[PDB]
Amino acid sequence: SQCSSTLVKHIKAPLHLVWSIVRRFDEPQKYKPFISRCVVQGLEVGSVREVDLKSGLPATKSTEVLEILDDNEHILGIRIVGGDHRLKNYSSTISLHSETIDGKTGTLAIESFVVDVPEGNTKEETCFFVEALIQCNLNSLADVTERLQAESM
Numbered sequence: 001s002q003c004s005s006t007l008v009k010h011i012k013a014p015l016h017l018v019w020s021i022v023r024r025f026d027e028p029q030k031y032k033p034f035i036s037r038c039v040v041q042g043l044e045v046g047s048v049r050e051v052d053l054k055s056g057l058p059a060t061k062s063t064e065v066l067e068i069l070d071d072n073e074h075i076l077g078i079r080i081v082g083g084d085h086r087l088k089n090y091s092s093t094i095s096l097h098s099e100t101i102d103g104k105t106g107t108l109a110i111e112s113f114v115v116d117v118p119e120g121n122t123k124e125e126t127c128f129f130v131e132a133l134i135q136c137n138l139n140s141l142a143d144v145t146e147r148l149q150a151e152s153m
């Protein structure tokens, strides 16, 4: 079985600023709070990033492949292909879109994933685990880019 879900986040910063952060396949640690470091050899499709998680977690690293980087429509797609975690066949897509909330331009982020349900867990538990982490990441992306936006004011 799999869990497939989509999360949406409203960000009070312009798309060009949010995308400048999200597009850095080589620098996820700039807003993903559970990631420490990241190294990419050679940002083209097929690029492989080796990700160091923060110390004190059950896993320590992830290996992920760049499946999509569309700089015109603002789509980033990745797939996890290794590491000392339990997540199997994880892939995700995030896209950014301009929107106007309260008369001010902002950015809508849409992030979708598909992942296997491990044999020892329920599908509900798998969805909850992944959705909570992505929500954490999207909340942090909003915090980071809204802060950059304020610092530019």
Ligand SMILES: O=C(Cc1cc(C2CC2)c(-n2cc(CNC(=O)c3ccc4cc(F)ccc4n3)nn2)c(C2CC2)c1)NC1(C(=O)O)CCCCC1
Pocket: 028, 032, 034, 035, 053, 057, 058, 059, 060, 061, 062, 080, 083, 085, 086, 087, 090, 118, 121, 122, 124, 125, 126, 127, 129, 130, 133, 134, 137
């Ligand atoms: O943000 C991150 C960073 C990131 C990446 C990883 C592992 C290396 C993939 C981890 N992790 C995972 C683990 C060990 N548990 C699992 O494997 C795991 C797998 C299936 C599970 C199913 C369940 F029912 C309950 C618990 C489960 N537990 N130890 N550390 C973390 C820790 C939990 C906070 C954070 N990753 C994502 C991103 O968008 O980059 C967003 C979340 C989804 C992956 C992509």
